[PDB]
């Protein structure tokens, strides 16, 4: 029997508020564990000691609440800069069990994207392939749609997107969609268009170019 | 105070091997509980091994055997000599100084794929254009594609521009190679005016190329 | 009981030890014997028995054994590699664990070097980690070396307190010492019998005597040197030994 700790993940809030995260303990543990802050693409940093005695070098926003089981952390008066996951552990015992991690989102309001379409560089068309990039800059609701169209034909299954972590300054997202074609197939059509749908747009925005027009 | 740095990650196939050196930048690795923490990408953490100030091992469950930890106090180095990697550990490795809890633990990567490409970039500049221009600002960037060895970096002007510079997560194609594109916005009055050169560095290989992005012809 | 980092040490001495009341008490969760299997304890004699006592977690009872490692066996209490005694352990959740946490049971978690077997260390110096002289001051590069189990009654097993007693039989080079109790039959007066009186092995009829043995003697002998009287321990009453009936 090992302990299996659990967490109600995927939080979403606004700044200056109260939020509270609990950590189950599916066995009788005592009162010695720890919380960590894992910013994305970085190393963890422990906040709560082996109970609630918050380790030094931290602000006054965290309040670890300890018990026999069902431990619980609480953030009051949020600040835009805590974009990361929070884990549980369990000191003392050698092989320790870790949590499941809770990402926490940060609500904003309404901010449409700047859109921009980039045709393939002349160097790449030598190589024999065409990447067509479309960029969506800064934007709260990430539930954006990127529809590629080639000569007004909606393109399915030759694109890839990725999205950035919520920005620590202005709490926005940015998205890059890449359409990949062969040189041969690229040279068979004229208008390349990228149509972005988003809540901050009253009707969708299309940025487009015409292959071969300086 | 203490600024643990680690080195030794790369790429290898099963039955391979690899020594990792948790270089104790900072003091007294002779008398501290040290450990290795592992996480696969998109996953939670996992614990690997631990050394006592006095010498003991206690390896983890699945990596029981086939995996060796040691220290060197006079060099202030922790040594992790592994071998016969089931390639199922392809993970991001951390070494942390357990001080009654943990904390103080650097970072370091590894991948154990059953192949090798190790090639490097295919860089193109994505020019600033009126289709990207809107009012006061316009965006330009660099597309770095088709590389296997995951850790790759693109900076703007040798690290100068930090405003608007946003590198998007790399994408894994069906071909098996990664690709990404990093873009930055800059006032539309400044399309070609100043320097905007993306510095592409591929650390598993030794690729270093600077590409200038200029408005479309 | 006593802490784990300053265990106790009682030196049991000359007496009559009955390891059966221990072995069969069924109240012990762990009764391992190493030098000697348990049932043959009440049939052997040594020079000294030592008994060490302390309190640990539930799942650290597996480090009280010859040849282990871990924070307990490394530097709290180390058993030699040719141990001879037995290790006994039983759960004590209701006595030692108290609501809010019993912070009076400490253990040592940092030491320069692992203990020699049966060595003991009650010092409380700051475990200087960083090259920087600690100067007896806490902070960075210097940890206090003792931690405390915070025992609480709602802890899963393996975190509840267990009390442990380690009996170690030793045999220096003396003349004798403690041993197990001995049996005792009855006096079949008038019946050619095969007898053993604490060493005296013989055969014959046993009969009530009327000789007055000194206040320290044991048996009696006759001219031509044959045993003809003994003294019984259980009672201490002269008894004659008449040869059997042959002819
Ligand atoms: C319980 C028991 O054994 N009692 C006996 C007692 O009857 C006897 O008179 C005495 C002689 O010393 O020894 C004892
Ligand atoms: C032996 O024990 C019995 C009681 O069982 C007692 O009556 C008797 O006096 C004792 N004799 C000696 C020598 O101890």
Author numbering:
A (entry chain K): 1 to 214
B (entry chain H): 1 to 217
C (entry chain A): 347 to 593
Article sentences:
RBD, which directly binds to ACE2 receptor, is a major target for development of the therapeutic nAbs against COVID-19. The prefusion structure of S protein exhibits more dynamic conformational changes in S1 region, especially in RBD, which has two distinctive conformations, “up” and “down”.10,11 Only the “up” conformation of RBD can bind to the ACE2 receptor. To further explore the interactions between nAbs and S proteins, we solved cryo-electron microscopy (cryo-EM) structures of the S protein in complex with ten nAbs, in full-length IgG-form or in both IgG-form and Fab-form. Bivalent binding was revealed for the full-length form nAbs, which showed that the full-length form exhibits different binding mode and induces more RBDs to the “up” conformation than the Fab-form that is monovalent.
The structures are labeled according to the number of RBD bound with nAb as mono (1 RBD), double (2 RBDs) or triple (3 RBDs) binding, respectively. In the S/P5A-1B8(IgG) complex, two or three RBDs are in “up” conformation and bound with nAb, whereas only two RBDs are in “up” conformation and bound with nAb in the S/P5A-1B8(Fab) complex. Additionally, the Fab regions of an intact antibody molecule can be docked into the cryo-EM map of the S/P5A-1B8(IgG) complex. Taken together, these results support the bivalent binding exists for both P5A-1B8 and P5A-2G7. The IgG of P5A-1B8 triggered S1 shedding most potently, resulting in about 80% shedding after incubating with cells for 120 min. The neutralizing activity measured by IC50 showed that the IgG-form was about 450- and 900-fold higher than that of Fab-form for P5A-1B8 (0.08 nM for IgG, 36.25 nM for Fab) and P5A-1B9 (0.01 nM for IgG, 9.12 nM for Fab). The first group, including P2B-1A10, P5A-3A1, P5A-1B8, P5A-2G9, P5A-1B6, P2B-1A1 and P5A-2G7, has the largest overlap between the epitope and the ACE2-binding site on the RBD. In subgroup 1 of group 1, P5A-3A1 has similar positional arrangement to P5A-1B8, but much fewer overlapped residues with ACE2 than P5A-1B8, probably explaining the weaker binding affinity and neutralization ability of P5A-3A1 IgG (Kd 90.09 nM, IC50 4.48 nM) than P5A-1B8 IgG (Kd 1.09 nM, IC50 0.11 nM).
